């Protein structure tokens, strides 16, 4: 059925990756991409991120028990990190 994709994204000049997140443990919904911003780093890397992608790992961290705000802070922190790069493992239908 479903499959896993590892997307590497580096942020643009505003520190933005170009996607929208919904979900988290505090919401009663899984963590999914709800928008790809066209031409953004998320849209242009290869492989690229798609709307509806379910986030599984963030830089290898298992996030299935984190809040929306925690997942957001994890993503923002990958920016000023070792390689400046965000590694996402997503599940795609």
């Amino acid at each position: 059925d479903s499959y896993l994709v590892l997307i590497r994204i580096t942020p643009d000049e505003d520190g933005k990756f170009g996607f929208n997140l919904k979900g988290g443990v505090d919401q009663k919904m899984p963590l999914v991409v709800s928008r790809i911003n066209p031409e953004s780093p998320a849209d242009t890397c290869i492989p690229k991120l798609n709307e509806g992608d379910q986030i599984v790992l963030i830089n290898g961290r298992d996030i299935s028990e984190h809040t929306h705000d925690q997942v957001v802070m994890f993503i923002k922190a990958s920016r000023e990190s070792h390689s400046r790069e965000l590694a996402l493992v997503i599940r795609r239908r």
Binding site: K16, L21, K22, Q27, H68, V72
Partner: peptide
């Protein structure tokens, strides 16, 4: 209500 966050 339900959260959507731009990043």
């Amino acid at each position: 209500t339900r959260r959507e966050t731009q990043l």
